[PDB]
């Protein structure tokens, strides 16, 4: 017919959704978490230092064994770091140095690399010849790739600069599922522990959840007022925190379908670049644009820890699967281990 | 002490030496970022010096290895990935003067130049301005006056006068005159004077950085 009907239909649908969310919201999270004892101050000391990189480190990812990790820098070299011996295990020379993300498969055989280039190339670490080579070349996208993650040994999720996400099959290199529900540049992804759902944060101040098999949008959250940079899933598979450049980090829930609690401060005016939970999810680590990193309590919303070991903007903050330690990497070519 | 970890430490040391060698090799070269409104004015510049996302063009001139990075095929929000180009040596900003009569594009080019020259990440990167299609602009001068898009312009319809006025208008948009240097040069389909001017501007940026690093100047 005409757009005037669809506009008012969408408007009344949004109004009904907001009214339902307001009616279902009976109490706040603070009133129910006040009965929980706070964690207090948690001091963390730097255990290991990694100065092998010569350029700005962008992203990193932990493995299943929580011992080896992959690191990507602006110089275009994928470095495999051993967290216990601080030795360089493997060095992968990249064809394009303009990379900003990397991935480590749960099996520990393949790794992904992407960035300003439209290809998140796959590199095999367990080659019989001992050298690293390109395993899969995903040249279907047209915008810069923001994040790539492994769902299994044959499927890989990827977020591009355009408002689309892709599920590539490593066996054939074709898009298995294409997500076009987003309206902004997808900036970060976060997979659920059950490997069935994954939530992505984009520049349109919204986070969208998608199924790895169905591909339909389940819930949409519009609590932020600025572009979301990083996102991480809760270890229980029911919630996730989203960080944006407005110095606020909002914790959304799948069952509640509403922002549970926001983390911000008056002196903290810089944006967030990395966010990740611990093993139990009680502590939330967040890297900001300043020279320091924060560790908040997921319940009391208090500054449980402050790490001032770096002198540049924090770029990546990875947490082990067992929560033994965390790895903080910034643009100062330094990757430190905290616990 | 260890049994097999000593060979692992030796391998790590060799990998670190190789990484340092690659870093020194990359520092020996020079990198530049190509920007500007319009694809033809940038395609002709890429074609004038040569031996999808981002295009990387390597070429050696006067023992200097120039690496031009073109991000014109991105079509995304620039303020989300421009920080990756903080360590570039120079920003070759190419614009076509013929846009002064085509629909309005001159205002967009000036706004883009003002946004680039005022970025917080480009506080230590110089910009080399290139004005392509000089013959087309000279032909259009005798057809339509310059005051079609510049209401404040009031003078004779002269090619050199209009060129100087456009250069002054582009230079006045830079609010960091005490820090940045604008190397405006008219370029077209001609001989290697373009790459010579690029080399001269690169040497100027290098000597300015070296003087600002060792002290005041």
């Amino acid at each position: 017919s005409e757009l005037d009907q669809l506009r008012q239909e969408a408007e009344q649908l949004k109004n009904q959704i907001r009214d339902a969310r307001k009616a279902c919201a009976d109490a706040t999270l603070s009133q129910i978490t006040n009965n929980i004892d706070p964690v207090g101050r948690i001091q963390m000391r730097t255990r290991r230092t990694l100065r092998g990189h010569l350029a700005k480190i962008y992203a990193m990812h932990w493995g299943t064994d929580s011992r080896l990790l992959v690191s990507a820098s602006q110089d275009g070299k994928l470095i495999i770091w051993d967290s216990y011996t601080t030795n360089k295990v493997h060095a992968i020379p990249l064809r394009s140095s303009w990379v900003m993300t990397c991935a480590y498969a749960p099996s520990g055989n393949y790794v992904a690399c992407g960035g300003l280039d439209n290809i998140c190339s796959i590199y095999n670490l367990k080659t019989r010849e001992g050298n690293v080579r390109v395993s899969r070349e995903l040249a279907g996208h047209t915008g810069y790739l923001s994040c790539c993650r492994f769902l299994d040994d044959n499927q890989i999720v990827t977020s591009s600069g355009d408002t689309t996400c892709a599920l590539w099959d490593i066996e054939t290199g074709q898009q298995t599922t294409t997500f076009t529900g987003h309206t902004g540049d997808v900036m970060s992804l976060s997979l659920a522990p059950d490997t069935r759902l994954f939530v992505s944060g984009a520049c349109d101040a919204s986070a969208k959840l998608w199924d790895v098999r169905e591909g339909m949008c389940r819930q949409t959250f519009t609590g932020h007022e600025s572009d979301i940079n990083a996102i991480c899933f809760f270890p229980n598979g029911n919630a996730f925190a989203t960080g944006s450049d407005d110095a606020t980090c909002r914790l959304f829930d799948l069952r509640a379908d509403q922002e549970l609690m926001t983390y911000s401060h008056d002196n903290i005016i810089c944006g967030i670049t990395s966010v990740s939970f611990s093993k139990s999810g009680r502590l939330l680590l967040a890297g900001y644009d300043d020279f320091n990193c924060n560790v908040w309590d997921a319940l009391k919303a208090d500054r449980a820890g402050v790490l001032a070991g770096h002198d540049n903007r924090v770029s990546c903050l990875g947490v082990t699967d067992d929560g033994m330690a965390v790895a903080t990497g910034s643009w100062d070519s330094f990757l430190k281990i905290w616990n | 002490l260890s049994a097999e970890d000593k060979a692992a430490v030796e391998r790590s040391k060799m990998i670190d030496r190789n990484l340092r060698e690659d870093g020194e090799k990359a520092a020996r070269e020079v990198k530049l970022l190509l920007l500007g409104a319009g694809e033809s004015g940038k395609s002709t510049i890429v074609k004038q010096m040569k031996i999808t996302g981002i295009v990387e063009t390597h070429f050696t001139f006067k023992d200097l290895h120039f690496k031009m990075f073109d991000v014109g095929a991105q079509r995304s929000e620039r303020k989300k990935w421009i920080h990756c180009f903080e360590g570039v040596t120079a920003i070759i900003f190419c614009v076509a003067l013929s846009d002064y009569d085509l629909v309005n594009r001159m205002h967009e080019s000036m706004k883009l130049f003002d946004s680039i020259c005022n970025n917080k990440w480009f506080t230590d990167t110089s910009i080399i301005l290139f004005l392509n299609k000089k013959d087309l602009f000279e032909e259009k001068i005798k057809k339509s006056p310059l005051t079609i898009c510049y209401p404040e312009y009031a003078g004779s319809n002269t090619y050199e006068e209009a060129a100087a006025y456009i250069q002054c208008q582009f230079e006045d948009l830079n609010k960091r005159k005490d820090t940045k240097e604008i190397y405006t040069h008219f370029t077209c389909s001609t001989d290697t004077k373009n790459v010579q001017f690029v080399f001269d501007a690169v040497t100027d940026v290098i000597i300015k950085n070296n003087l600002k690093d060792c002290g005041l100047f």
Partner: single-chain antibody
Amino acid sequence: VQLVESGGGLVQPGGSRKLSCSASGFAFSSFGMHWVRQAPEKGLEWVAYISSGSGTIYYADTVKGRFTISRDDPKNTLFLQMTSLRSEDTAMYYCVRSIYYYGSSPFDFWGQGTTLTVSASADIVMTQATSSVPVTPGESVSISCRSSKSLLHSNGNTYLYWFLQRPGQSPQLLIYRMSNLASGVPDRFSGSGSGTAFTLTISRLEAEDVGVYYCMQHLEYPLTFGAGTKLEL
């Protein structure tokens, strides 16, 4: 992956000879090399080892100073120069590739080896409990061996390797580090141990299991192979 050795045959006592090994199918400069000699009546025995960066060149106590090892990465060649060799050096030599990192499988591939025939303490001893055990298809066999000291290092890794030499073929790695099996090896084998006493079981034995089983420790550079257990079909 292919290793071609040459320069064997008859040799005069006290002479000089340079074994030449050519590698293909993998990065030669990335993998270190080992030379293992096998006597016509005895088992395997380590001779020399050269690293990937041509450093930390070590030799055994019995061949210290007499032999020399060199490598050429731009030429992709390995030269083993043996000068003034004794009469007890007549044996079959094999070149083995290896790499050292977390999760690596060293001693994975073994070369063909060449036979050279001469014309007429402070090491870890591997005491093997048996020399020959008859086996039948479908049954199970338990191989055990002891060492002079506990191989359980401080990092928790047990430097134990099991190789299988088939009659008429080069040995192959079955289980490395006592907890991981090499590529292309069936998972029916099971190796375990507490640091001193080790146990290797072979479930669902087949006809391809005929050969000699050698145990090796890697706690120190002077590697010492076991006596070997020959299984009769």
